[PDB]
Every structure is written in structure tokens, then in C-alpha cells.
Scaffold this active site. Structure first.
Site, mmCIF file in Angstrom:
data_model
loop_
_atom_site.group_PDB
_atom_site.id
_atom_site.type_symbol
_atom_site.label_atom_id
_atom_site.label_comp_id
_atom_site.label_asym_id
_atom_site.label_seq_id
_atom_site.Cartn_x
_atom_site.Cartn_y
_atom_site.Cartn_z
ATOM 1 N N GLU A 1 0.774 -1.166 0.006
ATOM 2 C CA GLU A 1 -0.086 -0.062 -0.081
ATOM 3 C C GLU A 1 0.997 1.459 0.018
ATOM 4 O O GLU A 1 0.786 2.202 -0.565
ATOM 5 C CB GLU A 1 -0.770 -0.091 1.328
ATOM 6 C CG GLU A 1 -1.693 -1.328 1.339
ATOM 7 C CD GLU A 1 -2.785 -1.423 0.505
ATOM 8 O OE1 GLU A 1 -2.727 -1.027 -0.564
ATOM 9 O OE2 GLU A 1 -3.774 -2.083 0.696
ATOM 10 N N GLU B 1 -3.878 5.020 -1.723
ATOM 11 C CA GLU B 1 -3.058 4.111 -1.116
ATOM 12 C C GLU B 1 -2.527 4.672 0.208
ATOM 13 O O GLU B 1 -1.785 3.771 1.048
ATOM 14 C CB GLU B 1 -1.891 4.184 -2.323
ATOM 15 C CG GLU B 1 -2.116 3.460 -3.665
ATOM 16 C CD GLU B 1 -2.857 2.126 -3.567
ATOM 17 O OE1 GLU B 1 -3.068 1.718 -4.633
ATOM 18 O OE2 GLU B 1 -2.974 1.651 -2.534
ATOM 19 N N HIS C 1 -4.994 3.326 2.578
ATOM 20 C CA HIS C 1 -4.769 1.806 2.797
ATOM 21 C C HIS C 1 -3.698 1.529 3.662
ATOM 22 O O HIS C 1 -3.538 0.456 4.388
ATOM 23 C CB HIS C 1 -4.731 1.232 1.131
ATOM 24 C CG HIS C 1 -5.757 1.418 0.549
ATOM 25 N ND1 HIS C 1 -6.018 0.796 -0.830
ATOM 26 C CD2 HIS C 1 -7.141 1.891 0.923
ATOM 27 C CE1 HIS C 1 -6.978 0.995 -1.133
ATOM 28 N NE2 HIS C 1 -7.800 1.465 -0.328
ATOM 29 N N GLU D 1 -2.739 -5.718 -8.767
ATOM 30 C CA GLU D 1 -4.184 -5.599 -8.349
ATOM 31 C C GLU D 1 -5.308 -6.189 -8.952
ATOM 32 O O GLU D 1 -6.000 -6.795 -8.313
ATOM 33 C CB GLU D 1 -4.351 -3.869 -8.305
ATOM 34 C CG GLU D 1 -3.763 -3.039 -7.364
ATOM 35 C CD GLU D 1 -3.601 -1.706 -7.469
ATOM 36 O OE1 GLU D 1 -3.180 -0.821 -6.414
ATOM 37 O OE2 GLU D 1 -3.831 -1.160 -8.854
ATOM 38 N N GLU E 1 -10.625 -0.140 -4.815
ATOM 39 C CA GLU E 1 -9.740 -1.143 -6.024
ATOM 40 C C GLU E 1 -10.346 -0.642 -7.346
ATOM 41 O O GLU E 1 -9.646 -0.680 -8.205
ATOM 42 C CB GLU E 1 -9.747 -2.404 -5.547
ATOM 43 C CG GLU E 1 -8.447 -3.008 -5.890
ATOM 44 C CD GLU E 1 -7.387 -2.289 -5.132
ATOM 45 O OE1 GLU E 1 -6.761 -1.646 -5.995
ATOM 46 O OE2 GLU E 1 -7.136 -2.692 -4.001
ATOM 47 N N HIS F 1 -8.526 1.906 -9.015
ATOM 48 C CA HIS F 1 -7.155 1.432 -9.532
ATOM 49 C C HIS F 1 -7.276 0.412 -10.658
ATOM 50 O O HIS F 1 -6.082 0.564 -11.416
ATOM 51 C CB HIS F 1 -6.444 0.837 -8.175
ATOM 52 C CG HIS F 1 -6.717 1.806 -7.030
ATOM 53 N ND1 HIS F 1 -6.088 1.296 -5.710
ATOM 54 C CD2 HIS F 1 -7.063 2.670 -6.854
ATOM 55 C CE1 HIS F 1 -6.280 2.365 -4.728
ATOM 56 N NE2 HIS F 1 -7.153 3.469 -5.606
#
Ligand SMILES: [Ca+2]
Ligand SMILES: [Ca+2]
Ligand SMILES: [Fe+3]
Ligand SMILES: [Fe+3]
Lengths: 510, 72, 168, 388, 388
Positions: free
Chosen positions: A97, A127, A130, A192, A226, A229
Site C-alpha cells: 500500500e 494508497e 490503505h 491489483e 480498488e 485502481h
């Protein structure tokens, strides 16, 4: 005079025009590709709306943790094995992360279109959220759990062991060192999209089965971010798809990215799931096949086909080395248990039956080995036995791939057993596969990472541990343990007395 | 000088008692046998804004638990 | 006295850098230190477990001395050696764009780092060359990356194959 | 079904019983404090530090690192993931920095989220209350749409100036702050556009298109030296610390502050405009938030580094001097804006006072920290030369 | 003990096993919507409505009530706990009202909480930025401290006017709205003191004591009729709807709006005061929020009642006439403050135009809704007479 306002979309409408032209308006990072300066982003967000949508998720999450979950003593009523497993899962994921922050910072610098920079920017902040979320999980289990050691100091105690090195390759360096696009492929296109996205959700499943309601509360919140991303990775390919350089390098940077990621997760994730739990959710072989082959390799990569993207050429090779990968690794992980920052447990009777049922042949190899170590007293500090001794006695050297840092023992492995050793300008190098070997042969200056045997050569085990603070509060009992029970914990002395000294296994070829 | 400064609830509340003023008809509209002291004081020095914040903090934990972990 | 973060060989080099009292000596010792202990082309691997830490402790001394010596315009535009930053930068990029192959390109880049990595060259020019040199290096290397079979690739790298084992 | 198929170890009788039986008698270590080994900046370790410090996997060869060894994978050429070679500044420990506001992600988005909703409410009140009726049309259609709008590119540029630093920062506490300093900048840019978009909604022939304010930025005369200075701080600087220091402790502290607080925040009220000041209040709040962090890093940490104090101070005075000129230049060009204001709006006596305000606060807040003996009179006079 | 002594039915194996044993196979009813029987104002029942409507245990003899029978215990004499006798207005259903903003407790304190913390950051940014330096001294010490300060007592008085309504409102939805209208008024009064408290901290010599503002309110001339009107609305009105209607659709819509928006919001900026407008922004936002609720209750629900529309409009037109005179008197006295301003601040034409703005908005948003024949020029004429 009707009440009026303006939403994010209405401002984002003009975000693309925010950037202007000027001689030196270009990325500061080396790259073979050309990101189109007219690339758009999927989610029309501005700083303030972004903060709001995330603040709302934080509220639920922390509200559950601080109130109901704490009232239910959720930090304690977790299986001992899983309390340990989360020390590694949360802290290791935390670094992924954290480096993803710098990676997307590099990608934001790489993008020329304002909207693409904005998309990468949303991830930068994500990030960051996270990083703090994974940190909070360890922080929470430390504050309220059955064993704080490891949870409370992983940031420094993780440096003792070998599993951490490989994690930094796919979660740190692989994310920020190389062509901006190569890093984008390691992080978003593969990392990811193929692993972390399905993984985060999977972890919440194994946690729930083992009594852990803390992780699901946090990881499920992380999961909701997510998609932005995923889009960022997808948009990275759309941005370079038109540059002729793409047809010359995309499929290689990708295949290298695929191999890099799977090389670590294939054995490590399967190991943590099946060996760091009591109650199981699904056999890793089945999981892996679906994630890598079905979902990613098929569905996902398939949609990028119109962009010149092709299945990694090393894909079938990944599936061949996979089957026994995680089972082979736990043998090394357990044999070297004193170098970790968590407590490991040998499979129980119910578990060995589960393994044999899902992995025919498991018992005859790994099973019999584990019962041998246990009968010999590997769990008892007065036995004077640490599994590493068994490997030496039976001449089964353990090597560290120079490229991936993944530990391997070709002499014992049931899976891959190839081994390539080379010497270059006074230095020896050990490789476990053909893809990694090429990476080093072509880019030797990108891979100079010293392994644990090289660093710890000539040092006695208990001294490496003490120096790197691998001890619990009492300053005598080891953080790491060969079992998860409350009694008979090993101390620094129980280790010192073994007089175990590190040797560089590659020197035997001299 | 020019140091980041602000004002809290207690600081304003110190003057709340002075907010009321006298006038012929300033009296309760409801029947009562008693006479509540004109200078009675209160235990907690709150003001609207601070009352709202301290209650919103509780709601956060309450509803988060209900909608998230407890529902799951 | 052995150790990962604290050991005799490190305490040895600290007393050694402490003897430096001239940007000239300091700069030179760093340049040579990088030639002997860094990159796969290092003169030896004897300091493998401490060279990273020692190099930095050496960069510090050089940086300080460079600040107490150079003026404002120099500290920003000239190398610790006296070279004109932009000159070196522009020259190295020329050689790189002229490089006939990846083997030639890789030597230009690596050598550039061992020679001008700050506090030698100013960071701005240094990282500026990093983006240009690296770009040219990857372009040559990633072209037909898998064409050369490993057997031949090993001969090209010039590695000494000590052991090969493969059941498949 | 009502109960579902998934059995949970915390609530399922069978599984829970198995877990309960495996539990130790008591915690296997009494130290339930994550981050207990981190040196507290304050009386006690704060959540901010526990969750942030040492997240970055640096080895000891990078001042403060707790790890060991080289990186696993590096750039073609050998450049390290993170390394001392990315900034001229040196220190005994890159993890010393501490955001005085102790902002980790949660509090950060909490505050900004409140601001977003506060903003939405203010706009619904302002539009319903018809307050737009008291705004001078010239000020709105020209100094807000064109000149204020154009300033959004300035802030946007300072935003991007942080991109490289997000990648190169050598520690977690520095990277978080840097990230937040930049994110607040893009926010300001999006607020300038939001205001123009709001005005387009409540003012019939108002055009929200960035066309006009953009051409002003890219081709105008007032922000010419401003843009040239921004393009420089952002794309010509490769040192992440020089970039952050020069943006927040030089350029935006002088130019940015004068434009926001001394021009628009001072004149807008005089034209029946309480709208622009609403948004400038945020920018100023943000500026002050960022400054406390800019000050802790470059002054408390680097400028006063137990080992590289003199050195770092020499580097920053060098940067100060290096960017002070393009900044004063940016100010000069800006001065040509006053000659466009309606007669009697302001006089040379007032602006001279506001210039000394920006300059003096700067000398007081930044310059005097690294001992960059600056001359207020010479600076102000150098700027005033831009007047009509 | 790590596990504790208390055993919980949700996690205790033996207890949960007993609970799970007694559970039905599926819900005993599929209608899982609390409040399903409430007539939705909008497309779908909202959380606001479900959690609120019918919380008040009214019997059917109070229009809209679902219960039956007399109250269990009444006042000495026989007065009912709640009854039709507490207000002149009549309706088909007291539960029809809906706060257009759908505010139940949680959303209400969430927003006010955001405003509190946003305010704290603003003051910290304002003070650290030294924005006080450009505020005209006379405006600060005389008009903010004394006159703006005195206005807190007006808002405080209007807050108290809601005490009886809190007790007498004939339905949950009305009580909640009335409670919130009153709570925002006390908040505004406290924000005025807060500003004075702030100024006392950043301006040496400034006295936060309420003595001066209070003497102005109780014995001055500028606010004499305003105070007389407030004491009346507060303590001479025993009808909870007359109080709420007269306060919000008459006095505060005319006097309040003029003072807050046309005087202070309008003139503060001309003296370099961005501080007061910050707090007035909140007052105006609150005012517009209340207006939506006031319009719904009195115009949408009562003034347009299918059975009592004509009756209710007659009553409200009566109240408007009853309170318009005292409100005009309030505005008239307030006109005296303009003489206190430094020469050249504003002029008779500006004042007149701003008066017409408030009167025209009032006629639009209120008077016309009940057919009250307001004569805008006659109203402005009456007030202007107060100009010295
Ligand atoms: Ca006039
Ligand atoms: Ca008339
Ligand atoms: Fe993430
Ligand atoms: Fe992600």
C-alpha cells in the site's frame, strides 16, 4: 432565488483544460512509451468529493471497530494461528500500500493529460488510506489481541526473515523501480487486477472462518476503492496503445510483470491461507487456477486484446511450477521459524486429512516430514532441534533466487527443482527459473539484492535475532515460535545453545 | 502575536447567563406553585455547536457498528 | 565486533572519512570508492554488506565540503571536480544516443552513475540524465527481449556457468 | 436464507468452541502498544506516529532506515528505488519530521469532507438569499472570471510541482505531508472553477468555460512571470526538497499570498463580493496548515539538523536566493493589474502596505529561519516598479 | 480475564446454540419496512419520515391522531396534555408537515458539528494569517462590539420565543422542525459572542464582556423597537403557531434579514471585515433552511389545507397585520444607526434599495402565499422616516 450548488462532475468538466503547454512540460521519468495527452479518466472526481466519499467509509469502519467489535472482544476470540497470520498479511500488505503511493506519484508525473494525472492522484491518496488501514489492523490486534509481539513491531522485526525480501520485490521495488509503465503493469495491470483485488476479499473470508471480524471490517472497506485502481491500470494501456513503441515493448514488460508478481504470490499466498489457518475456505490450487487462469488470464487480459495486449508467454510455465509451490515453501518457512516475527503451527490431524484429500500425495512427503520433526521435538525448547538442522543433515541446501528473493530447495521440492548457478566478476548467483535468470543476465545492475545467507554469513543465529530485536517484552522470549500454544515458548538462550551459524550455500560450488 | 488561536464552548458560555434581560412580562407561561431562582446555574458549559459535535461523535460509532459489523 | 548495522569495518571507514579535509580528496575518494565497490562491475565484492552505508557516509563529507567551498552558481551548476554539469550531462546523452547496442548503452549509463552520482554532480542535472539515459537503455534492451536463447545470452553476458540442473 | 450459508468463527457454536479452546490463558506479551519503539515527538506516542513512522522500508544506508541491504529491484542503469541521490539535503534521520497537525489519512479526509458539505450548504444559502444582487458586474465579469480564474492555473501548477516528490520523498512522515500539501493545492484550483461554475448557474450570460481565464494565464501580461516561474518550479526542478521548499517557503509565500490575501481577499469585499472570500478563506486556512509542516521539516528538522545544520541552511539560502528573483518578477507583472481596476479602488499607499505585510511575514516566517538576510525595502521597491 | 466473565448470546457457544435452536426458518412476516403505513411525501418513504411520523401519541380527536381516548393524566383544572385549544389554526392532519431538508436528529447535529470544526479551522487560519491587521478600528470597536453585539440578544430572544412551541406543538414533525428553528437561533447568538470572544484574544484591549452590547440592547435607541417586538413575540404570544409564524414569516423575514444581510453583511466588507461575514454566512444559511420548513408548514400544509385553507389564511393575514407594525417600528428605529457611520459609507438611495430588496423578497416568499396585500412603497416610506 432557488437553492443552487455545483457538483464534482460540473467542475471535472473543465479539469482536462487545467494543463497548458510549454517546452519542458514532460515526465521526469525514463520510459519507452508515450502516454497520450488527451487520455480521459473514468471517475469524475475532485479533491473534496473524493474526501467525502472516503470519510463516509472511514466512519462505518472505525465505528464498528471502536464500538461493537470491541464490546464483543473481537480482537481476542480469534484462532491463535490466524492472529499470527495477520501479523504478516497486514504488515506485508501495508508496504504494498505504501509503495503504491510513490508508484502512482510516479505515474501522475508520467501522465500528460490532466484527467489521467487526476486518476493516478486519486490512487495516491487511496494508497495512503490503505497504508494507514493496514497499520490500524496490526495496531488494533496489538492493542486488543492475544499476542501483540510482531503486530506491534513488524516494521522492524520483519527485516530478520527471508520472506520479507520477496515481498519488497513485488510490493515495493517492483512498484517503483523501472519504466513507469513497467511499474504500472506490476502494480495495477497484474498486481491489483490479478492478485490483490481478489486476495483482499479472500482474506476477509478466511478471517471470518477463523473468528476474525476485525480484518473483514477493514479489508472490505479497502476493497471499495480498488475499482479506481483497476481503471488506472486499464487506462495506462489505452494511453500508450497508439504509440508504435508499445507494439515493441508492452507484451514483454507485461510478461515480466506477470512472472514477477506470480513468482511470489503463488507460493506465499497459498501458504498463508492453508497453513496460517485452522478452518479452511477453499484449496489454493482451485483458487489460483480461477484467479490467474479464468478471471485474469482470460476475462481481464482478453478485454485488452484490442489494445495489442497478449497473455504472458510465461503463463503455462507459471501453472506448471504452481501446484506444489506453497507446500514446498512452508517447509522452508517452518525450518527457519526463528527468523520470523510470528508463531507457526504444524498441521493437526484434521488438517493433514484435509491436505491429503485436496492434494493427493501430500502426506507421503510433507506429512511424514512434519511428524518426524514433531516426534523429534521441534516444538519443545529442550529438544535442541530446529528443522534447519534436518536440512543440513540430509544435504538439502536452501537457496535464495537473486531476482525474486524467493527461497527454494531444489533437492527436496516436489514442484520446480531447476537450479542455475553462475559467477560474474567475483560474485556467485543462484536462480530458480528461466524467466528470472534472463532478467538478471540482461539487467544485472537491477538485481544486486544481498540475501540473508550473505548478510548473516558467519553469525550465530541468536545474535542476529537479538541485534534485530526479535524478542518479546521480557527481553528473553523469542517473538517467533514453532507452535502457537501458551506454554514452553522458546527463549534467546534456547537458540543460542544450538550454536547454529549461518553459511552461504552457494560457496559449496567453489 | 499571530499565533493560531480560537475560542471554545466554555469561553462563550461564561457569558451565557447575561443573555437574558429584564422586562415586565418576562415570566413563565405555565402554572406553577414554585419560583425558580433567577440566578440558578448549570453543571455543563455547553453551546449549540459543541453539543452538536459531541453527539455527532457518538452517532458515528453507533451507526457505523449497526450498518457495518453488526449487519455483517 | 561483528554486526549488521554496527561493525568493525564500518567504524573503520568512519575514522577514515573523518580524516578528509578537502573537497578534492573527499570527492576523489568517493569516485574511487564507487569504482571499487558498487555496480556489478565493482573491482571486488569485499564490502558487499557495508558499501551502501559507507558510500552514504562518504557522500555526506563530500557534500558538506562542497557547500563550504563552491559558491551559489557553482554549487548549482558545477561538479565537485570542477566539471560543468550541463556539459557532462549533454555529452553523456550524446554518447548514449550514439550507442550501437544495449551492451554499449549499459556501460555508458552505469559508468555515468559511478562517476557523477551526487554530491559529485548536482541532483537536478543528475536525475535529468537519469531520465534520458535510462530511456535509451531500456529501448535497446527491451527490443526482442526473448529472441536470444539463454545458452547464447550467458555467453554474451560473459558469465561463468558453474552449475545447471533441469529435470524438464 | 435467513441465517445464510457462511459459518462465522465468532458466532458459530462449533467453530467458536474450537477457537476458545486454543486461546492462551492471557496475552503472550503485555506490550499491546504498536509503534512502541518509535521516539515520540510529544509527551506520548500519538496514533499519527504509530500508524505512519517506519511504514517506508528504507535500509540504514538512507538516514534513519531500520532495514538492511540493497533494494530487490532497481531501475535499468542501477538507480535505487529510493536513495540519497535524489536531493541535495542531508540529515541524521529522514523520519524526524512531524506534521504539527498530525494528519494521517482519516482526519485529513474528515476535515476536507466537512468543508465540501459546508461549501454546498453555503452555496444553497447564498443562491436562495439572492446575495448575488449586490455584486459589481465589472468585478464579477472581469476580475473574477478572467483574473481570478487565471490564478487557478497557478495553483494547479504548484500542485503538479509535487508529483516527483510523491515518488522521491525519503520517509513516510515527509511523503504524507507532501502529498497533502499538493492535494490541497489542486483543491484550491477546483474551487476557483467551482465558483465560476456557480456564477454561471446564477448569472444568465456568464460563461464557465476556462477558455477566457486560460488564455489570460497562457498569453496575458499580468501572470506572465508567474507562469514562467511555475513552469520552472514544476518541470525544471528534479530535487524533491528544493521543489517543496521553493514552492511553499519562497514563491507561494510571497506571490501566492499577495494575490490571494492582499489583492482578492482585500478588494473583493469592496465590490459586493463575499463569494470569492468564502473560497479564499479555505485557501488561506490550507496555506497556514501546510506552513506549519513546511516549517517543521525544513527548519526544525533539516535547518537545525544536529549534524547538517550549516550545510542544509547553506543549501536553502541558495534556493531562496535562486527563486526569490523569479518570484519578485512574478509580483512585478502582477502589479500591472491595479491599473485595470476602476478609478478610486485602491491607491499606491495601500498596496505598499500590503506588500510590506507579505514581505515582513515572509522574513518572519521563513527567511529568518535559515538566516537569509533579506531586504524588505529593496524587495518592495523592486515590486512597486511594476505599477502603472 | 482476557475473555471476561459475562457470556454473550451472540458469541457464547452454548447460549447461541440455544438461540439458533428456537429460531424460525424464515421471518414471520415479509413486510420489513418500519412505518410502512405512513403516507410518503415523496416517491418512497424516507428514513426521516419512518423514524419520525407518529412518534407523538395523539388520539384521533387531535386531527391526524391514530390513538383513541383521553390522556391518562391532565393538568389541574383539566387542560389536556396536548389539545386543539393551544392554537387558533386548524387542519385535516397535524402530521402532514415535512421538513424539506428531511432533518431528524443525526443529520442535524452532523451538519452543525461540521460547521463547528470548520469554524475552528477558519479562526486558526484567520489569526495565524494576521488578517485582522486590515480591519478598520472604528468599525471593529464600535459597530461589531456594540451594534452587532447587541443583535445577539435579538436572536436570543427569538430563540426563547420557541420554548412554548417545543412543549405545545401538535405533532412530531412540527415539534422537531420548531426545535431546530429555535436551536439555530441560539447558535447564531452564541456565534456573535464567539466572534467578540475571538477579537478579545487577537486584539489587545478588546473587551468580550457583554456589558456594552447588553446596555445597547436594553437602553439604546437603535434597537428599542426591535427589543419591544421581541419581548412581545416571546412572552405575549401563548399560541405556538402565532409565535413561529410571526417570528419567521414576519419579524425575522423583514427586520432580521435587513440587519444581517443588508446592513452588516453589506457594510462589514467595506471596512476590511471578513470576520463578521463568516458568521453571517452561517446565519443566512440557517435562515434559508428554516424558510423551507416554515413555508411547508404554514403555506403548503395549513394555508393550503383542503378543508381549512380559507380559515387559516384569514388567521395568518391577521397575524401578519398584527406584527407588521411592530416590525416596521423595529426597522424604523434601526434607521438611526446609519447616522453613526463615518461620512460617505452609504447614502439614502442605497439604504432605500436594500429596504425594497428585503420587502420584495418578503412579499414573494411569504405575504403573497396567504394573499396578504402588502404595499411595498408604503412600508418602505414608513421605515425611512426613521432616518435622521
Ligand atoms: Ca448614490
Ligand atoms: Ca403602492
Ligand atoms: Fe491499496
Ligand atoms: Fe490499490
Amino acid at each position: 432565488r432557488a437553492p443552487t450548488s455545483v457538483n464534482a462532475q460540473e467542475v471535472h468538466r473543465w479539469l482536462q483544460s487545467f494543463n497548458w503547454d510549454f517546452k519542458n512540460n514532460r515526465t521526469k521519468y525514463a520510459t519507452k512509451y508515450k502516454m497520450a495527452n488527451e487520455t480521459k479518466e473514468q471517475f469524475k472526481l475532485i479533491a473534496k468529493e473524493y474526501a467525502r466519499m472516503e470519510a463516509v467509509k472511514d466512519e462505518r469502519q472505525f465505528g464498528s471497530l471502536q464500538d461493537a467489535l470491541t464490546r464483543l472482544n473481537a480482537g481476542v476470540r480469534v484462532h491463535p494461528k490466524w492472529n499470527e497470520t495477520m501479523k504478516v498479511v497486514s504488515n506485508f500488505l501495508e508496504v504494498g500500500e505504501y509503495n503504491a503511493i510513490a508508484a502512482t506519484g510516479m505515474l501522475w508525473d508520467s501522465a500528460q493529460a490532466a484527467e489521467q494525472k487526476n486518476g493516478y492522484l486519486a490512487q495516491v491518496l487511496d494508497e495512503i488510506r490503505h497504508t494507514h488501514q493496514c497499520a490500524y489492523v496490526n495496531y488494533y490486534f496489538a492493542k486488543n489481541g492475544q499476542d501483540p509481539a510482531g503486530h506491534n513491531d513488524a516494521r522492524r522485526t520483519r527485516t530478520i526473515g527471508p520472506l520479507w525480501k520477496g515481498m519488497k520485490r513485488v510490493f515495493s521495488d517492483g512498484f517503483i523501480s523501472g519504466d513507469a509503465v513497467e511499474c504500472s503493469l506490476n502494480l495495477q495491470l497484474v498486481g491489483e487486477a490479478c492478485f490483490t483485488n481478489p486476495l483482499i476479499v479472500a482474506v476477509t473470508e478466511w478471517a471470518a472462518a477463523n473468528g476474525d471480524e476485525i480484518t473483514p471490517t477493514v479489508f472490505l472497506s479497502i476493497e471499495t476503492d480498488e475499482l479506481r485502481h483497476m481503471a488506472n491500470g486499464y487506462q495506462t494501456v489505452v494511453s500508450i496503445a497508439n504509440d508504435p513503441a508499445s507494439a515493441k515493448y508492452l507484451n514483454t514488460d507485461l510478461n515480466n510483470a506477470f512472472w514477477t508478481q506470480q513468482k511470489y504470490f503463488t507460493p506465499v499466498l497459498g501458504m498463508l491461507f492453508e497453513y496460517g489457518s485452522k478452518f479452511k475456505v477453499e484449496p489454493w490450487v482451485k483458487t489460483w487456477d480461477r484467479w490467474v487462469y479464468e478471471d485474469w488470464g482470460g476475462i481481464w487480459i482478453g478485454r485488452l486484446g484490442k489494445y495489442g495486449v497478449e497473455s504472458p508467454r510465461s503463463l503455462k510455465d507459471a501453472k506448471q511450477d504452481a501446484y506444489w509451490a506453497h507446500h514446498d515453501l512452508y517447509l522452508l518457512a517452518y525450518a527457519l521459524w526463528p527468523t520470523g516475527f510470528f508463531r507457526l503451527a504444524l498441521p493437526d490431524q484434521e488438517e493433514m486429512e484435509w491436505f491429503e484429500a485436496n492434494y493427493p500425495g501430500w502426506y507421503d512427503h510433507y506429512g511424514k516430514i512434519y511428524e518426524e520433526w514433531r516426534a523429534r521435538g521441534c516444538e519443545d525448547p529442550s529438544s535442541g532441534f530446529i528443522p534447519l538442522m534436518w536440512f543440513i543433515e540430509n544435504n538439502h541446501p536452501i537457496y535464495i533466487d537473486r531476482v525474486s528473493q524467493v527461497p527454494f530447495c531444489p533437492s527436496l521440492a516436489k514442484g520446480a527443482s531447476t537450479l542455475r548457478v553462475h559467477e560474474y566478476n567475483g560474485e556467485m548467483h543462484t536462480f530458480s527459473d528461466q524467466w528470472g535468470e534472463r532478467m538478471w543476465l540482461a539487467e544485472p545492475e537491477r538485481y544486486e539484492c544481498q540475501n540473508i545467507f550473505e548478510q548473516y554469513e558467519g553469525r550465530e543465529l541468536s545474535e542476529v535475532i537479538a541485534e534485530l530485536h526479535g524478542l518479546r517484552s521480557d527481553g528473553k522470549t523469542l517473538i517467533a515460535q514453532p507452535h502457537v500454544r501458551g506454554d514452553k515458548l522458546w527463549t534467546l538462550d534456547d537458540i543460542k545453545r544450538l550454536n547454529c551459524v549461518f553459511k552461504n550455500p552457494v560457496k559449496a560450488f567453489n | 502575536n499571530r499565533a493560531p488561536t480560537s475560542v471554545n464552548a466554555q469561553e462563550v458560555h461564561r457569558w451565557l447567563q447575561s443573555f437574558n434581560w429584564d422586562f415586565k412580562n418576562n415570566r413563565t407561561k405555565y402554572a406553577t406553585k414554585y419560583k425558580m431562582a433567577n440566578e440558578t446555574k448549570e453543571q455543563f458549559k455547553l453551546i449549540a455547536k459543541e453539543y452538536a459535535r459531541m453527539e455527532a461523535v457518538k452517532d458515528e460509532r453507533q451507526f457505523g457498528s449497526l450498518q457495518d459489523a453488526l449487519t455483517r | 565486533k561483528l554486526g549488521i548495522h554496527s561493525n568493525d569495518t564500518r567504524d573503520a571507514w568512519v575514522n577514515k572519512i573523518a580524516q578528509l579535509n578537502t573537497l578534492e580528496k573527499a570527492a576523489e575518494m568517493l569516485k574511487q570508492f564507487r569504482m571499487d565497490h558498487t555496480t556489478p562491475f565493482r573491482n571486488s565484492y569485499e564490502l558487499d554488506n557495508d558499501y551502501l552505508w559507507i558510500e552514504a557516509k562518504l557522500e555526506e563529507k563530500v557534500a558538506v565540503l562542497k557547500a563550504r567551498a563552491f559558491n551559489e552558481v557553482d554549487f548549482r551548476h558545477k561538479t565537485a571536480f570542477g566539471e560543468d554539469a550541463k556539459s557532462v550531462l549533454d555529452g553523456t546523452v550524446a554518447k548514449m544516443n550514439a550507442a550501437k547496442d544495449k551492451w554499449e548503452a549499459e556501460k555508458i549509463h552505469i559508468g555515468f552513475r559511478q562517476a557523477y552520482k551526487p554530491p559529485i554532480m548536482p541532483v537536478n542535472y543528475f536525475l535529468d540524465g537519469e531520465r534520458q539515459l535510462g530511456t535509451r537503455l531500456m529501448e535497446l534492451r527491451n527490443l526482442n527481449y526473448y529472441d536470444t536463447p539463454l545458452e547464447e545470452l550467458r555467453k554474451q553476458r560473459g558469465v561463468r556457468v558453474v552449475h545447471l540442473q533441469s529435470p524438464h | 436464507s435467513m441465517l445464510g450459508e457462511r459459518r462465522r468463527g465468532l458466532t458459530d457454536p462449533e467453530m467458536a468452541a474450537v477457537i476458545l479452546k486454543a486461546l492462551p490463558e492471557a496475552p503472550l506479551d503485555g506490550n499491546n502498544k504498536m509503534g512502541y519503539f518509535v521516539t515520540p515527538r510529544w509527551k506520548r506516542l500519538t496514533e499519527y506516529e504509530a500508524l505512519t513512522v517506519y511504514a517506508q522500508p528504507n535500509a540504514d544506508w538512507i538516514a534513519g532506515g531500520l532495514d538492511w541491504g540493497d533494494w530487490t529491484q532497481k531501475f535499468h542503469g542501477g538507480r535505487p528505488s529510493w536513495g540519497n541521490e535524489t536531493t541535495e539535503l542531508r540529515t541524521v534521520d529522514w523520519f524526524k519530521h512531524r506534521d504539527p497537525l498530525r494528519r494521517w489519512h482519516a482526519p485529513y479526509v474528515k476535515d476536507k469532507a466537512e468543508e465540501w458539505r459546508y461549501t454546498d450548504r453555503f452555496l444553497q444559502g447564498y443562491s436562495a438569499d439572492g446575495q448575488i444582487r449586490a455584486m459589481n458586474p465589472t468585478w464579477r465579469d472581469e476580475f473574477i472570471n478572467r483574473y481570478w480564474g487565471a490564478f487557478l492555473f497557478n495553483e494547479y501548477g504548484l500542485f503538479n510541482a509535487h508529483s516527483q516528490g510523491a515518488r522521491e520523498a525519503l520517509s513516510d512522515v515527509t511523503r504524507v505531508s507532501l502529498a497533502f500539501w499538493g492535494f490541497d493545492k489542486i483543491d484550491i484550483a477546483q474551487m476557483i472553477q467551482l465558483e465560476r461554475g456557480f456564477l454561471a448557474k446564477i448569472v444568465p450570460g456568464f460563461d464557465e468555460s476556462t477558455a477566457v481565464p486560460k488564455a489570460e494565464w497562457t498569453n496575458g501580461e499580468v501572470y506572465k512571470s508567474a507562469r514562467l516561474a511555475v513552469e520552472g518550479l514544476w518541470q525544471e526542478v528534479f530535487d524533491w526538497n528544493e521543489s517543496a521548499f521553493s514552492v511553499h517557503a519562497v514563491y507561494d509565500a510571497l506571490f501566492g499570498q499577495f494575490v490571494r490575501r492582499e489583492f482578492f481577499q482585500r478588494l473583493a469585499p469592496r465590490f459586493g463580493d463575499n463569494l470569492t472570500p468564502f473560497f479564499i478563506n479555505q485557501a488561506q486556512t490550507y496555506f497556514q496548515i501546510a506552513k506549519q509542516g513546511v516549517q517543521d521539516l525544513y527548519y526544525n528538522c533539516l535547518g537545525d539538523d544536529p549534524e547538517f545544520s550549516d550545510y542544509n541552511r547553506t543549501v536553502m539560502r541558495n534556493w531562496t536566493g535562486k527563486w526569490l528573483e523569479p518570484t519578485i518578477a512574478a509580483l512585478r507583472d502582477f502589479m500591472g493589474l491595479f491599473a485595470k481596476l476602476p478609478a478610486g479602488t485602491t491607491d499606491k499607499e495601500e498596496i505598499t502596505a500590503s506588500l510590506y505585510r507579505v514581505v515582513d511575514d515572509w522574513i518572519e516566517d521563513y527567511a529568518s529561519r535559515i538566516d537569509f538576510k533579506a531586504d524588505r525595502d529593496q524587495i518592495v521597491k523592486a515590486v512597486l516598479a511594476g505599477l502603472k
